[PDB]
């Protein structure tokens, strides 16, 4: 699953080849700056350790040496700038080409990349993947070569000056390189590892949030919160172990640096004392070979990121190569010009590309001339829509062929074909565009004249006059701000402006009003003579005007002929017609007040590890002083031994203190985030649904808070004290020890350390992640891609993919340009600051030559002042960059504390209310009005009234959303109204309890939703916080014929169900949810869409679960088909807020109305 290296860089032109070769050479010369620097320093230390002894010409020697340092500094300035910029420009150009090209191929792909290859996963295989290639072939390969250079240069210097010590520093070099390698991997991408412990828990957190209303209604907070807590403690353990490992890694790196110092000096003093070497010879060889041996470990993540790069480029390239058999960028199909409209279907079969096992269609044969209109009648899902698709060559037959105007479409161009044809599907959708462009979608040259013409044609001119911004109003997403009438009218007008020739409609009058349906149909009919038409409708009003009427059985057209044809047959359509006629906050330390022993030991170890650097400065300056002074061999030997031993002990203390600081601050951080997520969640399940509706308060925002808050607050409590105290020990001691050893040089060199400190921070970001990678700009380009991606098959027949392809490019142009400039900007700052380090050895040491020449200090005094402020500012930067940001984290903690302290209007945990002793089961509604807090302008119900009694099985039926979802949340208290009055047995639910109400009665939702638990769990979940009996389950589970399918499946009551209902179908689940509240044994029965997805022979055993238990309960059944409603006691049909009817059934039948039709769909 990897693509070769030669076939990796294929989207690079001549300019990109010059950007890669020069960046590589520039990086090969910038990596030889450190080793060469150690060649000059070890040479300047032999000067400073031979003068003053015999101050003559000492100043002159230092000026010549200063030139060398400024030369290396300038070389590194130029080479760094080139390397970083050129490599970031070669990867910035290629990746852009690949984005455009990948997206160009994704659009022009044969239908069948949504059933076979999931689509969201395609967004993760696009955006993310593209970013992974970018990080792969980008700047990293620069970094690699540089480090490689520092290897070879290193050892070459090591072997040229003196080799007896290079073989020794090399004998241990595997371990040095291995520690460096391990540390390099833990340094890079150390912020992209926080979703491993919150991955398994993320699911449980998302699942409870997905159905908050069901948990509140059924009581089941407790067990959900408990599952959560368990997930938590697991993630906590993993986090602690990772913190321990990170700090052990850095500790071992420092232990090995220091023990290698110890060995180098213990042996190099034997060499020096035997006259063989000098001290410059030892400092050069040792420093250079050590730098080489670590900079070969710095080069491990480059190979790791390259392997990832090609491992993803494989799959991308295999998409881009995939040329579909049927497409529109082949341009080979003939373009016909004599169009008359000749639909010819002869033996057309089909098996779903999604599922080949079932052929829902078994052969058809029909012929339709121009102007000939045919209606099509059948059940919803008889292959009507899919056949209207297959008309436009959205698919191809499995046996046979479809032809038009004599010849078949299997050889001619499709673009002209899929253009000249208009098709309004079952549900036409519209995107985030303008109504001018909404209509203009068909083709290009559609003028405002044509726009106004179409809005006249489809009666779509009214909302122009009544709603302002008459031609530039931004319709909602998927057509939201509009209504069904506006949607359907702009749909028919748009389908008219494309200059159609064959017009195919699917359920053309689902939601259209009385006048609206008629005007839609007539506007369509005035265009039925110069253009063929085939219609599908369920209202038989939009069928009569067809020339022929067809009958769908197994997707086949078996009944054919005009009206009188089937009206003498007395068939199916006959039966149809005969039945019809804020503020910041600083108290966050009072969140983590309880874990103080941890912070005490943490501050202590921070102090020790921050003071270890001046200790090294002193020891190093003194161990060179050992060789400048005039002593004997024996005193030099003993002081060299003691100082080597102090180096070793410093290394060991460094290791221990690092592991300890890591342990303790990591454990305090994990305890904090654990407790914090627990409390956030707990306080989350107390807010009403009138808090949980808002789409500015979405599940995705909540999941980000749960994890993100954890991260942020853990940062802005523990890491802040870690960092401040390390840095204070470090630079406080460095500056204060320097000021008293020479103030002249410290005053100068303390006007540099801002830039050395800043230089360390910018480098650190460059070393691990921190490549800016702005995605907010990318999100806008991505959002356009997501739209087309959601309905690629539906849009392709519109042919608008061009006008979306370009909607990609013209958008990607903003950030690309910007990103280009940035790969220059960063390339200088980095470079500049690196240069500054190489310049310090020229300034300080030059000034040093002055002072040592006027006996205002000593050599080892300059070494101690320099080593303790320059290296100190380096350490200050590298430390202050290895910790989370502050202001971000402070804002996160601000919001978390904002929500923690919350107090809901109505508490679900609070016991308040009415806890009566008796009840009969009566409900009454009066002048009750109900409104959202987010949607006040659109009303649903308009102050209705009801009267429901005990055992009385209420009957209610409506269309798709006239207010039947309304009444549910009014009885199980998700909603609060501002008007009306409700009397449950004369006892208002606005006074009565809200949890005591819930242990008393139990309802069923539209659909069953379920757990990652056992089947026994969800069915027993229906009642909690009380001793549940295994037999009560086998009571209702058998009572509903649902245990029958439980005892057969292995682990009958012990099979861990799939997620949310993937391991079974609906008919299996529609039992267990009614059976869920069956075990509740309430005093009020409520169902809603209980025959939604269930077998007509199981709707008996599921409705019999009612009848023998209807007793005592205020039974309110609501279904779609009247099969179960006709046995319900009292029928209350609704229409848009006003109570359409209420009373005995024959009150609804002798006076015939909208119900007289609602039972007239398919009666027998």
């Amino acid at each position, epitope marked *: 699953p990897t693509v070769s290296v030669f076939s990796m860089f294929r989207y690079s032109n001549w300019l990109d080849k010059l950007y890669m070769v020069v960046g590589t050479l520039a990086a090969i010369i910038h990596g030889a700056g450190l080793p060469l620097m150690m060649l000059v320093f070890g040479e300047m230390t032999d000067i400073f350790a031979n003068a003053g002894n015999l101050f003559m010409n000492l100043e002159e020697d230092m000026t010549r040496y200063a030139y060398y340092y400024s030369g290396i500094g300038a070389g590194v300035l130029v080479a760094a700038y080139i390397q970083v910029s050129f490599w970031c420009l070669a990867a910035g150009r290629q990746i852009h080409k690949i984005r455009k090209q990948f997206f160009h191929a994704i659009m022009r792909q044969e239908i069948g990349w949504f059933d076979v290859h999931d689509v969201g996963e395609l967004n993760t295989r696009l955006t993310d993947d593209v970013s992974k290639i970018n990080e792969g072939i980008g700047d990293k390969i620069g970094m690699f070569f540089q480090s490689m250079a520092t290897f070879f240069t290193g050892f070459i210097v090591g072997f040229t000056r003196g080799w007896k010590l290079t073989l020794v520093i090399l004998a241990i070099s595997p371990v040095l390189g291995l520690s460096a390698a391990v540390w390099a991997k833990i340094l890079s991408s150390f912020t992209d590892k926080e979703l491993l412990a919150y991955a398994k828990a993320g699911a449980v957190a998302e699942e409870v949030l997905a159905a908050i209303r069901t948990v509140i209604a059924f009581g089941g907070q407790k067990k959900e919160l408990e599952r959560y807590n368990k997930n938590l403690e697991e993630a906590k353990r993993i986090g602690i172990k990772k913190a321990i490992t990170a700090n052990i890694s850095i500790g071992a790196a420092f232990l090995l640096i220091y023990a290698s110092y110890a060995l180098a000096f213990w042996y190099g003093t034997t060499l020096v004392l035997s006259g063989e070497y000098s001290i410059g010879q030892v400092l050069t060889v040792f420093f250079s070979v050590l730098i080489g041996a670590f900079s070969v470990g710095q080069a491990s993540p480059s190979i790791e990121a390259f392997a990832n790069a090609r491992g993803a480029a494989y799959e991308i390239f295999k998409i881009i190569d995939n040329k579909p058999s049927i497409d529109s960028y082949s341009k080979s199909g003939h373009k016909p010009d004599n169009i008359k409209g000749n639909l010819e279907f002869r033996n057309v079969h089909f098996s779903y590309p999604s599922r080949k096992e079932v052929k829902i269609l078994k052969g058809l044969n029909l012929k339709v001339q121009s102007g000939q209109t045919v209606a099509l009648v059948g059940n919803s899902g008889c292959g009507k829509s899919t056949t209207v698709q297959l008309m436009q060559r959205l698919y191809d037959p499995t046996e046979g062929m479809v032809s038009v105007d004599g010849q078949d479409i299997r050889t001619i161009n499709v673009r002209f074909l899929r253009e000249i044809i208009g098709v309004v599907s079952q549900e036409p959708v519209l995107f985030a565009t303008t109504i001018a462009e909404n209509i203009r979608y068909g083709r290009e040259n559609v003028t405002m004249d044509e726009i106004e013409k179409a809005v006249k044609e489809a009666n779509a001119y009214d909302f122009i006059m009544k709603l302002p911004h008459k031609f530039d109003t931004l319709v909602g997403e998927r057509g939201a701000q509009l209504s069904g009438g506006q949607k359907q009218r702009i749909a028919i007008a748009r389908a008219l402006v494309r200059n159609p020739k064959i017009l195919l409609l699917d359920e053309a009058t689902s939601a259209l009003d009385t006048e609206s349906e008629a005007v839609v149909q007539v506007a369509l009919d005035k265009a039925r003579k110069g253009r063929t038409t085939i219609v599908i409708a369920h209202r038989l009003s939009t069928v009569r005007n067809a020339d022929v009427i067809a009958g769908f059985d197994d997707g086949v057209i078996v009944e054919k002929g005009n009206h009188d044809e089937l009206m003498k047959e007395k068939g199916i359509y006959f039966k149809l017609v005969t039945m019809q006629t804020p503020v910041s906050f600083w108290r966050i330390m009072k969140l983590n007040l309880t874990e103080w022993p941890y912070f005490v030991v943490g501050v202590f170890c921070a102090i020790i590890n921050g003071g270890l650097q001046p200790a090294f400065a002193i020891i190093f300056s003194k161990i060179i002083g050992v060789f400048t002074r005039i002593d*004997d061999p024996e005193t030099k030997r003993q002081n060299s031994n003691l100082f080597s031993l102090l180096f070793l002990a410093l290394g060991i203390i460094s290791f221990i203190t690092f592991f300890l600081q890591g342990f303790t601050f990591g454990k305090a951080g994990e305890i904090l985030t654990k407790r914090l997520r627990y409390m956030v969640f707990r306080s989350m399940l107390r807010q009403d649904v009138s808090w949980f509706d808002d789409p500015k308060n979405t599940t995705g925002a909540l999941t980000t808070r749960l994890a993100n808050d954890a991260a942020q607050v853990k940062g802005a409590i523990g890491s802040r004290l870690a960092v401040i105290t390390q840095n204070i020990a470090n630079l406080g001691t460095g500056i204060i020890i320097s000021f008293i050893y020479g103030w002249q040089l410290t005053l100068l060199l303390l006007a540099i350390v801002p830039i050395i400190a800043i230089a360390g921070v910018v480098e650190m970001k460059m070393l691990s992640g921190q490549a800016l990678k702005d995605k907010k700009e990318l999100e806008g380009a991505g959002k356009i891609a997501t739209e087309a991606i959601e309905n690629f098959r539906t849009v392709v027949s519109l042919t608008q993919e061009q006008k979306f392809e370009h909607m990609y490019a013209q958008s990607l142009q903003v950030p690309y340009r910007n990103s280009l400039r940035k790969a220059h900007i960063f390339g200088i700052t980095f470079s500049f600051t690196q240069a500054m380090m190489y310049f310090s050895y020229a300034g300080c040491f030059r000034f040093g030559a002055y002072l040592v020449a006027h006996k205002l200090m000593s050599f080892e005094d300059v070494l101690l002042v320099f080593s303790a402020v320059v290296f100190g500012a380096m350490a200050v930067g590298q430390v202050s960059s290895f910790a989370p940001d502050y202001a971000k984290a402070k804002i996160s903690a601000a919001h978390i504390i904002m929500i923690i302290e919350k107090t809901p209007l109505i508490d679900s945990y609070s016991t308040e209310g009415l806890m009566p002793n008796t009840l009969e089961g009566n409900v009454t509604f009066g002048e009750v009005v109900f409104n959202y807090p987010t949607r006040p302008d659109i009303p649903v119900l308009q102050g209705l009234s009801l009267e429901v009694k005990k055992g009385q099985t209420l009957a209610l039926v409506g269309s798709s959303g006239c207010g039947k979802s309304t009444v549910v949340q009014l009885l199980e208290r998700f909603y609060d109204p501002l008007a009306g009055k409700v009397l449950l047995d004369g006892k208002e639910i606005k006074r009565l309890n809200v949890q005591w109400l819930r242990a008393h009665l139990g309802i069923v939702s539209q659909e069953p939703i379920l757990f990652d638990c056992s089947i026994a769990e969800n069915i027993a979940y229906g009642d909690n916080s009380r001793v549940v009996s295994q037999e009560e389950i086998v009571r209702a589970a058998k009572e509903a014929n649902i245990h029958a399918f439980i005892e057969s499946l292995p682990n009958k009551y012990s099979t861990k169900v799939g997620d949310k209902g993937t391991q079974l179908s609906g008919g299996q689940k529609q039992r267990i949810a009614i059976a869920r509240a069956l075990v509740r044994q309430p005093h009020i029965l409520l169902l809603d869409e209980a025959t939604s997805a269930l077998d007509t022979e199981s709707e008996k055993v599921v409705q019999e679960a009612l009848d023998k238990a209807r007793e005592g309960r205020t039974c309110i059944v609501i279904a779609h088909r009247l099969s179960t409603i006709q046995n319900a006691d009292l029928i209350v049909v609704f229409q848009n807020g006003r109570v359409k009817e209420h009373g005995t059934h024959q009150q609804l039948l002798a006076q015939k109305g909208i119900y007289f039709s609602m039972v007239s769909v398919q009666a027998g």
Partner: antibody, heavy 119, light 113 residues
Framework: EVILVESGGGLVKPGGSLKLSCAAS????????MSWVRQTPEKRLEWVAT????????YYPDSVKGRFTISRDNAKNNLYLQMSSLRSEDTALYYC????????????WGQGTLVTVSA | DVLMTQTPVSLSVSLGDQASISCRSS???????????LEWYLQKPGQSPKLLIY???NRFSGVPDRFSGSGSGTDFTLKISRVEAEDLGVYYC?????????FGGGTKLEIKR
């Protein structure tokens, strides 16, 4: 040049206590190992003590250890030898001595300070 | 310890002649580093001794070219050519290889008159 001048010697009663000093001018006194050497009245030299260039290390032979104590003061450029419980065999002339880079042990001496020890 | 002897005692050298002064150690003088320290010191009547040649074969800055010193192991010798009256005193062969540093007896140089 390098001018060392010592002082502090005279007649002492056995078991007594005395303190010789050696003041040095003309170089960077805070950088050189310094030794004390002694010449007995048979005219046969003998090493007596050494001190490194910062005061840390110090070396005595195996017949003086415990009694003598040599120390230095870099601020005034002084080198002291405090002798306690003197014997009858410690009657001799006492030279300062500097140490020379390239590892020669007594580069630049001083003049004696005779220290007679008797009753 | 290590005791350094010096076999000649009374030298009767004449102006223009040569002189050979031995120093025959007892243990073998070789430091851990591998260097061999053995310096020669001169004392002219009534003065502090002055350093002559350090290590084994070297000359302090400010000495004549007639002074030679060669040898190996425990045997070391000093030679003086063309003896000039400015060269008359007692010669000590210091050695610093082992933790008690020990001078030598001393040789008297009596120029013939």
């Amino acid at each position: 040049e390098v001018i060392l001048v010592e002082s502090g010697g005279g007649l002492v009663k056995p078991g007594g206590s005395l303190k010789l000093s050696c003041a040095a001018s003309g170089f960077t006194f805070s950088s050189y190992t310094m030794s004390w050497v002694r010449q007995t009245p048979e005219k046969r030299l003998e090493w007596v003590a050494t001190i490194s260039s910062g005061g840390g290390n110090t070396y005595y032979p195996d017949s003086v250890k415990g009694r003598f104590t040599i120390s230095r003061d870099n601020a005034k450029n002084n080198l002291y030898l405090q002798m306690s419980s003197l014997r009858s065999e410690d009657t001799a002339l006492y030279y300062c001595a500097r140490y020379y880079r390239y590892e020669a042990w007594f580069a630049s001496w001083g003049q004696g300070t005779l220290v007679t020890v008797s009753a | 310890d290590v005791l350094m002897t010096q076999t000649p005692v009374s030298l009767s050298v004449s102006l223009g002649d040569q002189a050979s002064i031995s120093c025959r150690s007892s243990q073998s003088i070789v430091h851990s580093t591998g260097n061999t320290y053995l310096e020669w010191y001169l004392q002219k009547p009534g003065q502090s001794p002055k350093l002559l040649i350090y290590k084994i074969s070297n000359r302090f800055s400010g000495v004549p070219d007639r002074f030679s010193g060669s040898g190996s192991g425990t045997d070391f010798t000093l030679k003086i050519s063309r003896v000039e009256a400015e060269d008359l005193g007692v010669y000590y062969c210091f050695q610093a290889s082992h933790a008690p540093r020990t001078f030598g007896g001393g040789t008297k140089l009596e120029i013939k008159r």
